Write a protein that binds this ligand. Sequence first.
Ligand SMILES: [Ca+2]
Length: 89
Amino acid sequence: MNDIYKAAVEQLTDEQKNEFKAAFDIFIQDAEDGCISTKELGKVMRMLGQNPTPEELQEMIDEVDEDGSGTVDFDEFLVMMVRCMKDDS
Ligand SMILES: [Ca+2]
């Protein structure tokens, strides 16, 4: 049952739409596609409250990135939140 990932994004709060959107806007400032740079997610995690490595952060990105285009969309961005809260246990 992987409906929990979509169920949360369907009834999420405005704080979530602004929490990630804040970093999303700064990272997607010079971009015109609608996605941040997965490789530059190190600056995102640090802002979120985590300071991992470039090899470790890339792993969690590819995991949340359903397509794995090397870019995190707002949908993939907010997903990472629920993915950490609930996914295994
Ligand atoms: Ca993607």
